[PDB]
Subunit: 244 residues, 2 copies
């Protein structure tokens, strides 16, 4: 018994008009005959061409980041602007943004609350570094990151939340991934509620390929993927098939 799986593409800061048109065509031709939420997150400037060309009924378009409000924030894209554009998914707290772009736990938690309150589906990213893993701090870190997010949310917000676990420490066996997912679900179950925990999607966001996806999705607490490199390739289709 699992909730609806999600297979999300994080294109990060990659792509050309040519490469995106070729990829979206193949994604459009792929017949998906099971209940799965597919997500593509392009770079901001590619969002329009993706919205225009993507016809696959299982897909939604997501942003890779956002700020809460419109105004004098040169270079940033706000959640109101995204909604006007027709985008209602957003990735927040990706490890790259936590590492390079000043997104502390509190910044991430406030962004998630803002997205929730403006009616977004949120893929919120957590995960521990190699230094943190080698000091035995996996549980403390992922639970503390999740706790920061949970602190700004009412119980009913969780239908709009998806967690994505990034094993930053590896940039992992399916068993190491399962152990962290289980630990996350246990926390949500005890602290937030049993019903909320059952229904929550916890996506694996380490290295996902056509080669390992099926074995990863066999695990009871893995509800799909936040895919990096392989989501720039026709291989993404096979990763979607692996959640049958």
């Amino acid at each position: 018994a699992k909730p609806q799986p999600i297979v999300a593409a994080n294109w990060k800061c990659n792509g050309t008009t040519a490469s995106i048109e070729k990829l979206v065509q193949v994604l459009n031709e792929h017949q998906i005959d099971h209940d799965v939420q597919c997500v593509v997150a392009p770079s901001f400037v590619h969002i329009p061409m993706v919205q225009a060309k993507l016809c696959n009924p299982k897909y939604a378009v997501s942003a890779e980041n956002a700020i809460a409000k419109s105004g004098a924030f040169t270079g940033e894209v706000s959640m109101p602007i995204l909604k006007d554009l027709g985008v209602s998914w957003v990735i927040l707290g990706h490890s790259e943004r936590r590492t390079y772009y000043g997104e502390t736990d509190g910044v991430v938690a406030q962004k998630v609350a803002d997205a929730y309150n403006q009616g977004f589906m949120v893929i919120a990213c957590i995960g521990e570094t190699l230094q943190q893993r080698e000091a035995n701090q996996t549980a403390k870190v992922v639970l503390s990151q999740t706790a920061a997010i949970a602190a700004k949310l009412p119980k009913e917000a969780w239908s709009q939340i998806v967690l994505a676990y990034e094993p930053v420490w590896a940039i992992a066996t399916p068993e190491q991934a399962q152990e962290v997912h289980a630990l996350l679900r246990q926390w949500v179950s005890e602290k937030i509620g049993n019903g909320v925990a059952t229904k929550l999607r916890i996506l694996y966001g380490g290295s996902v390929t056509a080669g390992n996806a099926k074995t990863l999705y066999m695990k009871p607490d893995i509800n799909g993927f936040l895919v990096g490199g392989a989501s720039l390739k026709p291989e993404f289709r096979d990763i979607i098939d692996a959640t049958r």
Copy 2:
């Protein structure tokens, strides 16, 4: 005797599909009969619709920010991606990005060098805070910011550089603006070269409206504008006319 003026719109983090279509239509109908480089910088997600609808022969589209390279930089837009898209202008070092998003002098200077080397026109922003102005540090600060940028550039790069002076301290009389522009030009003249200084555009990026633009452009060291709030309005056309 002045170099070609530039009138650049910084839309910051503002706009709807509806408001942009209405604005671009009016900008498209505006007949401009003098030599001026017009620039529109939309939020990243609006770049496609602006490129698609904007027909005015005096305009180029600009990004409001960028990073140097494509790759694993979730949420950011790279200069290669912009070029593939057909964008060859970029605003860098805006005060909002210096203040809120970690852009030190060195970060800004490296971004400007990267843009130069990838063939962009760059509007590089400098300016001092109220605290800096009240401690008599206007010259030191704007010259130190310009120096950080100049340090990463060969002499021949300056044909691709435009400076924009932001009087952050006011968020200013035309005479206070002129005094800073003159001081910037003097520095470039003595340190970089007389020929480079004559030809360089120094844009005023404080509060510009249809009401004050003509008086501002009368000043000998002001070569146009980086416009904030008024560039979201039909008033922008009159600001363009003021550089006749």
